[PDB]
Design a protein that fits this description.
The structure is cut from a larger assembly and holds two copies of chain A, one copy of chain B (40 residues), one copy of chain D (213 residues) and one copy of chain E (84 residues). Chain A is mainly alpha-helical. Chain A has helices at 47-54, 81-104, 118-129, 141-151, 163-172, 174-183, 186-193, 197-213; strands at 6-7, 13-14, 20-22, 36-39, 111-114. The radius of gyration of chain A is 20 Å and the shape is elongated. Chain E has helices spanning 17-32, 47-56, and strands at 63-67, 73-77. The chains are: A mainly alpha (225), B mainly alpha (40), D alpha/beta (213), E alpha+beta (84). Chain B: It comes from Komagataella phaffii (strain GS115 / ATCC 20864) (Yeast).
């Protein structure tokens, strides 16, 4: 029954007649050998824990970034453009939490197979760049925000400029972008992982390259598999 | 406060559109009631 | 209704199918040529209390215990018989307090006709319930729901699992959550809910079968299978009747069967 | 009693018909949408309690958004039948009423059964479209079920864009039957394409397309 | 007609594994049938190893024609496809 089903060069799954069976293989366009169980950090926990983990307030002094983790800790309080950037990040995280908790996974399950193991990449960066010791980081907050935002628009599953292509591309990477935003959060990067500029750029490039390597190859006989 | 003002403006516009659509709907309700009375 | 046991039992009783044959215990045919009196001495008091066509008499003895267990009233059964039979049969029923619960009948060579009427009555008198739902069970379901603090906490709720399927009628019963009723037959799902719900139900059944013994299969394989099985707008079986009724080449189809 | 449950089922069917009309593009006032059961009993039922189906008929017109999106959307006439069994006489009378009162589409809800002659007369009512529904299958709105994702009919421009983007013929798309319950709920005609946005455990969201037969 | 202009090519810019296997096999067969080699071989003798060396240096003189389901095609040079 499934012998003549093959993934084509436009990403669709079709039979010998050219009839479309799936508009994207696996609804994500990924290979079955390239995914691993990972936890999405915005789904579980309480609202207090979520707020404590992700919210960064530059006005209140006891609910801000620690002063020993950043070299620019002095001229950071009181900014409004940066506070607007942080608020935009937090609103995006809240939208992701609402989406995952209400539409995708309603019973609270958060351990699902996804590509690009982020924990392994983060610990590899820590080992390579010697991110131990209490040394302050030179990684500015707008750099973090813009790096993550740009990374979330270079995960190409489909190529093209058509609006339908862009809509399908945005649909195909929703869960993975939620995972990336949940991990590479500003407070998490600055306090839990303690990345610097070089480590951050290495992590972004590695995520992009590994996501490119996890896509299914045209010509696969996925029906027989 | 600017965001609240924009939200109030959008709510007022939506309310005006709803009022106009209700005014349009009442004529259809009256015509349907008259035709159902004619059927009886 | 999901967190209360009594309302759940009320719904269960209202859903389960109950026929006359279930509560009936024995049926008898008696000869009595007096319309206003009777020969039987045990029932003479009750029938004369009531009073204060053909000679053939039809009285049936119903089990009290199972009639009370199903939570049924004799008047209800009398109205059901009256509705299905109009005025063609005169009906009387002993009250609740009677030692043996009985309900007689009189027609208005007819012994065989009365026998056929009794057999038909035993066969297809539906007292209450959805036809096709033979039995109903009460089940407790552990469901994880977020709290008011956002934390996920387990919970317990009541639900019904039946034997036999009638999705359309059970979905319309008041007290039933009509937006979540599920059937393990996806042909009925296709007839009631459409082809996308059929795809989801087919995946759920295949996942159940695979995952029961602890095995794990990646989602994309079963997704591709159910997408092939539902791509034509109807259910396509993995058989010669499904595969070989396609528009594929003759050489490709002949090599299967 | 049985009269109360008949009234309740009729009210649920009426609410589902209003929801169906609102989902197809026509405008139904929010007060009409949330019109409660007691108001229904007051407006329809008489002193002895029997309901008049002839008082439940209504009219509708498309919203400007729907009219801009779909240009083939006319006026809608919904009428419930008092006669339990609908013969060729009643179908012909309804067809005559629709032809004289220039309606684009008319929905005819029957109670028990429709005669085959009436069904055979349904296709010959062009350019107007008549659709028949049963009372019993309208008690519950199937589109509110958890297993039924949201279906959205596509415009001609959107269908052309889809076919150009994927470089497809119409026969190469996934199909949906004309007699499908959701297709009948949306009033799908042959050759029309619906967009089905769906939940996905691998990508979060997934948009599928099907073409009507 | 069926050809697709180089500016609007929408297929992946990476060499798939099937294309890599086929290109290596074809180039090895051609090298074993006395075709000129475009890279400097130090001491290599096996045609497959020479073909792999040519692939790593982007010197394979072959074109991949990728077919779309409708019949059109895109032409990609082996030197402009990214190989891991």
């Amino acid at each position: 029954a499934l012998e003549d089903i093959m993934v084509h060069y436009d990403g669709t799954t079709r039979n010998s007649l050219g009839d479309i069976i799936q508009f994207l293989y696996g609804e994500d366009g990924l290979d079955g050998t390239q995914v691993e169980r990972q936890t999405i950090d915005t789904i579980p926990g309480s609202d207090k824990a979520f707020h404590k983990r992700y919210y960064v307030d530059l006005m209140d002094e006891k609910n801000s970034i620690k002063p020993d983790v950043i070299e620019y800790a002095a001229d950071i309080l009181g900014d409004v453009e940066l506070q607007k950037e942080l608020n935009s990040e937090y609103e995006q995280l809240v939208s992701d939490r609402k989406f995952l908790r209400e539409i995708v996974f309603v019973n609270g399950d958060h351990n699902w197979p996804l590509p690009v193991n982020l924990r392994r990449i983060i610990q590899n960066a820590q080992q390579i760049f010697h991110l131990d010791r209490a040394k302050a980081s030179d990684l500015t907050i707008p750099e973090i925000i813009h790096g993550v935002r740009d990374l979330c628009k270079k995960l190409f599953v489909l190529r093209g400029e058509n609006e339908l292509i862009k809509e399908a591309q945005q649909n195909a990477t929703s869960l993975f972008q939620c995972l990336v935003r949940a991990r590479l959060a500003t407070r998490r990067i600055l306090e839990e992982f303690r990345l610097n500029r070089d480590a951050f750029e290495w992590v972004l490039g590695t995520i992009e390259a590994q996501f490119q390597r996890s896509l299914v190859h045209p010509g696969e006989m996925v029906g027989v598999i | 406060e600017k965001r609240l003002e924009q939200e109030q403006r959008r709510l007022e516009e939506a309310r005006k559109r709803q009022e106009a659509e209700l005014i349009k709907r009442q004529e259809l309700i009256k015509q349907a009631e008259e035709w159902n009375k004619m059927d009886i | 209704i999901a967190l209360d046991i009594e309302k759940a039992k009320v719904i269960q009783s209202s859903i389960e199918y109950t026929t006359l044959k279930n509560v009936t215990s024995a049926t008898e045919i008696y000869y009595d040529p007096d319309p206003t009196s009777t020969v039987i001495e045990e029932d003479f008091d009750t029938v004369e209390a009531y009073f204060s066509q053909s000679p053939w008499l039809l009285r049936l003895e119903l089990d009290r215990a199972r009639m009370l267990d199903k939570q049924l009233t004799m008047n209800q059964v009398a109205d059901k018989i009256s509705e299905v039979f109009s005025d063609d049969l005169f009906v009387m029923w002993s009250e609740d307090n009677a030692d043996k619960l009985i309900i007689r009948c009189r027609v208005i060579e007819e012994d065989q006709m009365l026998k056929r009427i009794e057999a038909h009555m035993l066969d297809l008198i539906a007292l209450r319930g959805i036809p096709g739902i033979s039995k109903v069970y009460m089940v407790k379901h552990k469901v994880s729901v977020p709290d008011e603090s956002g934390e996920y906490k387990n919970e317990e709720l009541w639900a019904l699992e039946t034997d036999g399927i009638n999705l359309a009628e059970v979905m319309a019963v008041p007290g039933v959550d009509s937006s979540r009723t599920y059937s393990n037959s996806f042909v009925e799902i296709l007839s009631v809910l459409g082809i996308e719900a059929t795809r989801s139900s087919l995946y759920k059944e295949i996942l159940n079968v695979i995952a029961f013994d602890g095995s794990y299969v990646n989602y994309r394989h079963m997704a591709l299978l159910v997408d092939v099985m539902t791509s034509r707008g109807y259910l396509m079986a993995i058989t010669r009747h499904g595969i070989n009724r396609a528009d594929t080449g003759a050489l490709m189809r002949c090599s299967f069967e | 009693e049985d009269n109360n449950r008949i009234i309740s089922r009729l009210w649920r069917s009426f609410r589902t018909v209003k929801e169906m009309a609102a989902d197809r593009g026509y405008f139904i006032s929010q007060e009409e949408m949330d019109q409660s059961l007691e108001e229904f009993r007051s407006k329809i039922c008489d002193s002895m309690g029997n309901p008049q189906r002839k008082l439940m008929s209504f009219l509708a017109n498309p919203t400007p958004e729907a009219l801009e999106k779909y240009s083939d959307l006319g006026t809608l006439w919904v009428e419930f039948c008092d006669e339990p069994s609908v013969g060729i006489k009643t179908m012909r009378n309804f067809c005559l009423r629709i032809q004289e009162k220039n309606f684009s589409t008319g929905i005819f809800i029957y109670q028990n059964n429709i005669t085959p002659s009436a069904n055979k007369m349904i296709p010959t009512v062009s350019p107007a479209i008549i659709e028949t529904f049963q009372e019993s299958d309208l008690v519950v709105n199937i589109t509110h079920h958890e297993l039924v994702p949201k279906h959205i009919r596509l415009s001609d421009g959107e269908k052309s864009q889809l076919l150009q983007r994927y470089k497809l013929k119409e026969s190469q798309l996934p199909r949906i039957q004309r007699e499908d319950p959701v297709a009948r709920y949306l009033g799908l005609k042959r050759g029309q394409v619906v967009k089905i946005i769906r939940r996905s455990e691998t990508s979060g969201r997934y948009a599928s397309y099907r073409i009507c037969l | 007609e069926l050809a697709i202009l180089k500016e609007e090519r929408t297929t992946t810019p990476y060499l798939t594994k099937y294309e890599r296997a086929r290109i290596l096999g074809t180039r090895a067969l051609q090298i074993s049938m006395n075709a000129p080699v475009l890279v400097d071989i130090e001491g290599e003798t096996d045609p497959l190893q020479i073909a792999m060396k040519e692939l790593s240096q982007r010197k394979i003189p072959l074109v991949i024609r990728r077919y779309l389901p409708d019949g059109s095609y895109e032409d990609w040079g082996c030197d402009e496809l990214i190989v891991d």
